[PDB]
Amino acid sequence: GAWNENQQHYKYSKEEIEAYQVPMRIKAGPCVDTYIPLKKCFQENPTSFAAKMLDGRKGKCAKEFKYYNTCLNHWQTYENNSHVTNAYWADTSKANADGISNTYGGSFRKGLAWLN
Amino acid sequence: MRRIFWNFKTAFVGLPMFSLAPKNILVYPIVVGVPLYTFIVLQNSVRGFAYFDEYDSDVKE
Amino acid sequence: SGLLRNFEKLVCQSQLSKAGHKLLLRSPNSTLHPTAFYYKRNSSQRLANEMDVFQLGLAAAALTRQANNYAQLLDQV
Amino acid sequence: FQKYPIPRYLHVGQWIVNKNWKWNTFHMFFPTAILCFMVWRNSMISTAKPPNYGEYVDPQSPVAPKAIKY
Amino acid sequence: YLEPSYFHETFGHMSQPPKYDLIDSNINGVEKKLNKQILHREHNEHKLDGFVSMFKGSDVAK
Amino acid sequence: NVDQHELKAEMIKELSHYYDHHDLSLFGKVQHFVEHLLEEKHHAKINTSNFDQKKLENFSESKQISRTVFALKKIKTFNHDFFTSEEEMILEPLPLGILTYGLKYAFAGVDAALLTYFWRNWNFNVRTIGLLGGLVGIQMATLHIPNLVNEVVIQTPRRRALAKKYISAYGPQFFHDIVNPKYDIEHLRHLQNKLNPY
Amino acid sequence: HGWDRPDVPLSFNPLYVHKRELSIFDTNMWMYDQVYPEYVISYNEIHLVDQWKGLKESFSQSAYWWAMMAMVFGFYFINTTPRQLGIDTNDLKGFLGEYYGQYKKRSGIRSNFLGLDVTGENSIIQPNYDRKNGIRDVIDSLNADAGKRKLINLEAKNFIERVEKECEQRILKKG
Amino acid sequence: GDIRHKFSNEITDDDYDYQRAMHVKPPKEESLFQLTNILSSVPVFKTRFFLDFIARNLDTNSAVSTSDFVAPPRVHENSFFVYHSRELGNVIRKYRSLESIVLPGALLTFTYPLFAAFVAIPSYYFMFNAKIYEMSRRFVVRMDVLPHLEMISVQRIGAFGILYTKLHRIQDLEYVPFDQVKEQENYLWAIGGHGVDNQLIFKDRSTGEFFYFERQGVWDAKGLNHPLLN
Amino acid sequence: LSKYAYFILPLIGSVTAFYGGLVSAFQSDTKKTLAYSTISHCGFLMVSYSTGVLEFVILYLYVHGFFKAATFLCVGNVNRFNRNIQDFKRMGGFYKYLPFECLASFVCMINLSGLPLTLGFYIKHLLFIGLVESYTLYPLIFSSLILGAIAGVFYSYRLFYSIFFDTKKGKKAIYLQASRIILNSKFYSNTSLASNLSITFLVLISYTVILYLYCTTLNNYYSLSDLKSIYINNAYSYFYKPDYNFLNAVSILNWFVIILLISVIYLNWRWSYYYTKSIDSLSKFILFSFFFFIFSKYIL
Numbered sequence A: 001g002a003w004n005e006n007q008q009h010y011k012y013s014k015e016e017i018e019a020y021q022v023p024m025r026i027k028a029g030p031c032v033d034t035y036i037p038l039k040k041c042f043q044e045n046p047t048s049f050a051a052k053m054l055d056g057r058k059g060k061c062a063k064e065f066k067y068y069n070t071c072l073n074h075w076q077t078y079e080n081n082s083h084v085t086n087a088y089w090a091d092t093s094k095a096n097a098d099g100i101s102n103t104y105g106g107s108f109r110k111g112l113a114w115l116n
Numbered sequence B: 001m002r003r004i005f006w007n008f009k010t011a012f013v014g015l016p017m018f019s020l021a022p023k024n025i026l027v028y029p030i031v032v033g034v035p036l037y038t039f040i041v042l043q044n045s046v047r048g049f050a051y052f053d054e055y056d057s058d059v060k061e
Numbered sequence C: 001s002g003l004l005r006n007f008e009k010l011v012c013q014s015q016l017s018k019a020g021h022k023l024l025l026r027s028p029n030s031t032l033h034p035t036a037f038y039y040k041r042n043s044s045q046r047l048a049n050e051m052d053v054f055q056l057g058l059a060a061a062a063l064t065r066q067a068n069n070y071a072q073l074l075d076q077v
Numbered sequence D: 001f002q003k004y005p006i007p008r009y010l011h012v013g014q015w016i017v018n019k020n021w022k023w024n025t026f027h028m029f030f031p032t033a034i035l036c037f038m039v040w041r042n043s044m045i046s047t048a049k050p051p052n053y054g055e056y057v058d059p060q061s062p063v064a065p066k067a068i069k070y
Numbered sequence E: 001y002l003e004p005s006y007f008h009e010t011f012g013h014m015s016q017p018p019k020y021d022l023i024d025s026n027i028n029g030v031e032k033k034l035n036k037q038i039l040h041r042e043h044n045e046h047k048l049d050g051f052v053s054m055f056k057g058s059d060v061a062k
Numbered sequence F: 001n002v003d004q005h006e007l008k009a010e011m012i013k014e015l016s017h018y019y020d021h022h023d024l025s026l027f028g029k030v031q032h033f034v035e036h037l038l039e040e041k042h043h044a045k046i047n048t049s050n051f052d053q054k055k056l057e058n059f060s061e062s063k064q065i066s067r068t069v070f071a072l073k074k075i076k077t078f079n080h081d082f083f084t085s086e087e088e089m090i091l092e093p094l095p096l097g098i099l100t101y102g103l104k105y106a107f108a109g110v111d112a113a114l115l116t117y118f119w120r121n122w123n124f125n126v127r128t129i130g131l132l133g134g135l136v137g138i139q140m141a142t143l144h145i146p147n148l149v150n151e152v153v154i155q156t157p158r159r160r161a162l163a164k165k166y167i168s169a170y171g172p173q174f175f176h177d178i179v180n181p182k183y184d185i186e187h188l189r190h191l192q193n194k195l196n197p198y
Numbered sequence G: 001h002g003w004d005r006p007d008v009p010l011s012f013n014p015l016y017v018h019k020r021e022l023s024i025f026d027t028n029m030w031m032y033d034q035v036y037p038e039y040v041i042s043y044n045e046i047h048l049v050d051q052w053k054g055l056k057e058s059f060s061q062s063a064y065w066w067a068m069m070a071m072v073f074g075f076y077f078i079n080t081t082p083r084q085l086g087i088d089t090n091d092l093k094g095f096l097g098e099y100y101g102q103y104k105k106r107s108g109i110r111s112n113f114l115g116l117d118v119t120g121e122n123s124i125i126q127p128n129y130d131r132k133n134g135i136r137d138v139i140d141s142l143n144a145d146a147g148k149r150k151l152i153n154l155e156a157k158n159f160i161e162r163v164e165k166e167c168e169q170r171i172l173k174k175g
Numbered sequence H: 001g002d003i004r005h006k007f008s009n010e011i012t013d014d015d016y017d018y019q020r021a022m023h024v025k026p027p028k029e030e031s032l033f034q035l036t037n038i039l040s041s042v043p044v045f046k047t048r049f050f051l052d053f054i055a056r057n058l059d060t061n062s063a064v065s066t067s068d069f070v071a072p073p074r075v076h077e078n079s080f081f082v083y084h085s086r087e088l089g090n091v092i093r094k095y096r097s098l099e100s101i102v103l104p105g106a107l108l109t110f111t112y113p114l115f116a117a118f119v120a121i122p123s124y125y126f127m128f129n130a131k132i133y134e135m136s137r138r139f140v141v142r143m144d145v146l147p148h149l150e151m152i153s154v155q156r157i158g159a160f161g162i163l164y165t166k167l168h169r170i171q172d173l174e175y176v177p178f179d180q181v182k183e184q185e186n187y188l189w190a191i192g193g194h195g196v197d198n199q200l201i202f203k204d205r206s207t208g209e210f211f212y213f214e215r216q217g218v219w220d221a222k223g224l225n226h227p228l229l230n
Numbered sequence I: 001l002s003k004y005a006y007f008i009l010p011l012i013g014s015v016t017a018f019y020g021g022l023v024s025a026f027q028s029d030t031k032k033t034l035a036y037s038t039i040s041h042c043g044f045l046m047v048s049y050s051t052g053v054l055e056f057v058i059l060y061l062y063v064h065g066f067f068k069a070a071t072f073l074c075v076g077n078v079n080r081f082n083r084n085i086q087d088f089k090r091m092g093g094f095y096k097y098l099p100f101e102c103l104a105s106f107v108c109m110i111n112l113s114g115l116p117l118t119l120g121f122y123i124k125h126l127l128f129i130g131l132v133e134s135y136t137l138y139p140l141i142f143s144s145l146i147l148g149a150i151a152g153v154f155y156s157y158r159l160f161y162s163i164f165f166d167t168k169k170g171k172k173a174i175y176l177q178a179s180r181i182i183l184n185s186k187f188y189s190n191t192s193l194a195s196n197l198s199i200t201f202l203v204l205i206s207y208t209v210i211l212y213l214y215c216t217t218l219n220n221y222y223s224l225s226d227l228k229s230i231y232i233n234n235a236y237s238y239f240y241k242p243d244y245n246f247l248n249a250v251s252i253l254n255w256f257v258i259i260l261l262i263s264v265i266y267l268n269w270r271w272s273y274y275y276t277k278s279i280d281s282l283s284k285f286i287l288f289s290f291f292f293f294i295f296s297k298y299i300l
């Protein structure tokens, strides 16, 4: 159910993270549980860099990449506050009236060039 | 260099060759190939072409 | 110079190549008479000091024409 | 640049071409390769690599890093 | 062709060529209308659920 | 609790301007307002009890295949874990390629060049405007053409093969029940695909 | 080709004849050579008489680039919103956690493991666990920014939950 | 002097044919898919309807200049023609006509018209004012002389592609040396003063109006050799 | 863990990038132009390191190294043909004498200068993705970065056009001696076949390696090995899921680049027979761009 959970709802231990050689950038984020099966499948499915750079479904690594992509979307949205920022950009007056996030709304200036 | 001399479309090696080679190469394959192949294929189906379905395939989980 | 267009009203360059033809050019915003260029009230110095006989005559003719027209309008007030 | 004469006594490398350079290349490449092979073996005796994919270090194994017992 | 993000940023988003499944033509009658209404409601609810999941799953990772 | 469909309709009404509306120009806003009137009504509750089902015996085999293709499309719309990547690609509209995109932008360039020529020479008349309208209409029609050719020629045999694979594994009666508007969409969400290794 | 050129002339390396006394006050101020001796430092911008005149000219002409940088900054300042940048808030026990953990454990001032009556403070390079300067300002700013982003996400979640509850109340109340 | 004939494997001129698309060379042969060959081989272009369509569309022969002498229609009944621009005036008018469609189109079709204006302001002030616009403002599209007023009618181009005619007294005209206006307007003469005669610059001193004449413009000998203009 | 680094890397990097790019935009010597371009790109590398993302540093380093090396080889062939005269004030019309040099230099300059739709554009965009805004001297830093990023167009265009497609500013001996009818042969070349093959293979391998690095780092599936760094910021969030304000800012930068391209292409610094027709071409290009935008966005 949760975005950070993988297909099998299995949490990976520190020894498993070390053995599977998870990059530190992924390790800092919360998507290790969904990244590890994707890397395991890619190790089991060695493809050229062109295949990764061109295939949109990632070929054989379809379900694992779907879970990892959902987790990545949520992770990079929360690290960015991009949902709140886009909500305030779409309608700055309505967002302030509704009080989506007063902390962000109290210091938000859209800019003159962007429809004032 | 290789200053080729070749009467195109009026020569035996050219358009007449293109018109002549397929009609003669495909003589035996078309006069003894088709009849022999048809006989060999249809001699089996004296009663039918049906595939006796072993391994079921009529069963579903 | 034009697609699906006929140029019947267009003036021919053959016509333009002849000197002395009777074509008149009517252009937008064409002020062809300086009837109002040199009329100014509350002059700091003499109109003769700042303007010559040509400009003064232009202004005087414009004022005379306007005054005569207004006096003509006075007959139905 | 236009070629100019070089003194015969001077051991300089200006416009020097050896007509037998192929055998010299052979006998300067192959023994160098052998020497580097020997040095490579010697240095490969002392070489460290991290564990491969799917391999973890047991913390209680002798391979694991150790701390001084005072 | 493959990374048009420069055009998206510099000239905005253009009108994409029409892509549609034309798969609803299989069924005919009022059933088609009911299924089309159901699918439109599902698409709107799916967009709303995506928005709500983005705004709710913030504290899931702890 | 409350009806989920009505709750989601109310939340859509409350939050539509947050995610479904982006910045638009004046003409963009005009087009958006025009299309809003022409847009389909989002009805929370749809009366599916007014429909009467027809049994499979009425439909022929080809019609059953078409209806189970629609059933698979419905399942893919509702349950996103049902189909594999290749099955989804078979069941999804085919992405348009360089032929279609270059065709569209060549049409746009031709239109822009013609309009530039008309403006620079002030060649604006009834015939010219009719030519522009006919050209843009034909271009729109023949840009709709590649999608139709793609869909039919490529996808339709693949979709029918997929349906025949699914018919022999699930059941024509199962798919006929699925295509029925009274079918529980909540139950359809939790349906497990027997033809998916997961 | 087309002419039998003689060998390269000896004039290609003209012999330099010293016409001036090599002053000891100019020692190594010249690259000495029998062909083309040079001054040790080349001044291609000699149209500036001094280095002070050169500084004046540089600061006079750099004012244009100061103005252009000001224009660019103003354009990007009245048309762009500051971004949500900082350390990854999903990993606060890492780079930020280790800094405060080191400043909290104070393991560098412990007693000697042999009882030598010397601690870490008895060195030219000694620990200072009550310093409060340097990179600590940046660490505090990063921690504050991470907390601010977490608060924004929490406020967004509270807002969406409140909206859902309000919608449920509105639909249920009417009946 | 070429010695490619002495050798067999040496490259021929026929091999240097792919360079014709990149190197200008007199024609040697017509290819199968050349445009001329396509037009002269496909019979649909031999039909009368295509010939009639071509013969009645595109540029008309009436607009083609038929002589090296032209007498533009008189601006006034008594005026006589002196000078007229030829192509620079047309290009200037077509460029300033962009403000009549693109500028309103920018307002009605750009998502951020304020952004468009904020980028256009420095473009105008730093690059385009001294390039086209200020030269257009000082550009003399047409010059005639009204003798009864002893004045000159100068027709110029205005903001949205407009045309407007102003009258200037002949006695108030003065010659402005380029060196006199060299340093104070160097940018304009650097990027936007090539199509006008920088050695033939005049000024109405009453209003400080600058008269620039196109280098490709046509002058009438009769009008120029007039006692009013000396 | 250094406050001195946090303060000195972005400021010095941005100042260096601005200075190098600006001076390279004014250099008449080819080698000096490329040296100041190298100075600018080293400043940009310092800035990229100050952003906290090491992958961007690696990508920028690889792209700059490959394309700067290729451009150096091309300008070296040009200098050898010009007989050790490096200034392009004595060049022009070298496209015919150096065709391969012209085309390869075009490719390597459009990649090196970070023109849009190129790998240099990608690395500069990544640099602006991770630039931190918490610096006290951010105004100066950001202004210098913008002015140094827009400076690639100027020096790339000046070098290419002046070397190859300007007027014949060179000396008559350079042109006439290489154009004698006797020299016409299948072996004719003002460069070396080995030089041409080396530059071609260098460009091909550079493209392959840069694409491999982009797939290893910039893909959705991050497949790069550990960089042994525990300082992880959120700069990848704006690369993956950016907001609208950042997109509009990078749009501002892109339109600045577009205006500079318009300036360099259409500005007439000298009298020409095509001066009027150049202005006509600019006008019709503006109108065509407007109508193309109208049709491609609304009509169809």
Ligand SMILES: COC1=C(OC)C(=O)C(C/C=C(\C)CC/C=C(/C)CC/C=C(\C)CC/C=C(/C)CC/C=C(\C)CC/C=C(\C)CC/C=C(\C)CC/C=C(/C)CC/C=C(\C)CCC=C(C)C)=C(C)C1=O
Binding pocket: G058, G059, G062, G063, G065, G066, G067, G069, G070, G073, G077, I015, I019, I135, I136, I137, I138, I139, I140, I143
């Ligand atoms: C064009 O360069 C230059 C070179 O080439 C690199 C040179 O070789 C040389 C030659 C130098 C030498 C021979 C030796 C000298 C050594 C040096 C290192 C000199 C280097 C000089 C510079 C790099 C130029 C710096 C000069 C100026 C005037 C800075 C230019 C930037 C601006 C004018 C932008 C104006 C910024 C404003 C108005 C900020 C206002 C504040 C806000 C809007 C608040 C925003 C809120 C925040 C939280 C942000 C915080 C911002 C703050 C605190 C502002 C602080 C920043 C500042 C810049 C003051 C010179 C003179 C030069 O000149």
Ligand SMILES: CCCCCCCCCCCCCCCCCC(=O)OC[C@H](COP(=O)([O-])OCC[N+](C)(C)C)OC(=O)CCCCCCCCCCCCCCCCC
Binding pocket: F094, F095, F096, F097, F098, F099, F100, F103, F134, F135, F138, F139, F142, F145, F146, F147, F149, F150
């Ligand atoms: C007043 C004006 C009057 C005239 C107005 C204009 C009238 C029409 C003028 C011609 C334009 C025709 C447009 C419709 C074309 C429809 C094509 C179609 O059905 O595509 C289905 C699709 C288009 O594919 P696609 O590119 O959209 O994507 C397919 C899906 N993916 C990406 C997954 C692969 O398939 C094909 O076209 C099949 C490909 C093989 C076609 C073989 C025939 C020869 C053509 C080869 C391609 C083009 C080569 C030449 C390119 C140009 C060179 C100069």
Ligand SMILES: CCCCCCCCCCCCCCCCCC(=O)OC[C@H](COP(=O)([O-])OCC[N+](C)(C)C)OC(=O)CCCCCCCCCCCCCCCCC
Binding pocket: E009, E010, E011, E012, E013, F025, H102, H103, H106, H107, H109, H110, H111, H112, H113, H114, H115, H116, H117, H119, H120, H123, I248, I251, I252, I255, I258, I259, I262, I285, I286, I289, I290, I293
């Ligand atoms: C209140 C005032 C309202 C009116 C202000 C009008 C200001 C602009 C006047 C000049 C307009 C003509 C130039 C742009 C023509 C359209 C180009 C286009 O497709 O833009 C898409 C976009 C439209 O997209 P958009 O504005 O809807 O949103 C996406 C774009 N961003 C995110 C960047 C805002 O047009 C612009 O961004 C316009 C920028 C104009 C900047 C000034 C240009 C000066 C130089 C003129 C020559 C330009 C030649 C062509 C350059 C582009 C093509 C290579």
